[PDB]
Ligand SMILES: [Zn+2]
Ligand SMILES: [Zn+2]
């Protein structure tokens with residue numbers, strides 16, 4: 310029979326912990342939550358504008374999410 314792992318992790322890149330995928334971050338929050346906080350702080354904690362700016366992030370490829378994170382989060 311198969312020795313393959315049962316139900317292997319299939320986590321989306323946006324749902325991985327910041328400090329798992331980015332060696333420059335110490336946060337344990339999912340990438341998408343770190344990006345959300347960046348936009349919230351930019352928008353004085355207006356969730357409506359924040360949701361508009363986050364929408365395109367969900368259509369980004371993983372390489373684009375890394376590029377965005379390094380632009381706005383890596384400080
Ligand atoms: Zn076998
Ligand atoms: Zn299962």
Ligand SMILES: [Zn+2]
Nearest residue numbers: 318320325329
């Ligand atoms: Zn993971």
Ligand SMILES: [Zn+2]
Nearest residue numbers: 338339341342
């Ligand atoms: Zn979350």
Ligand SMILES: [Zn+2]
Nearest residue numbers: 346347349350
């Ligand atoms: Zn904040």
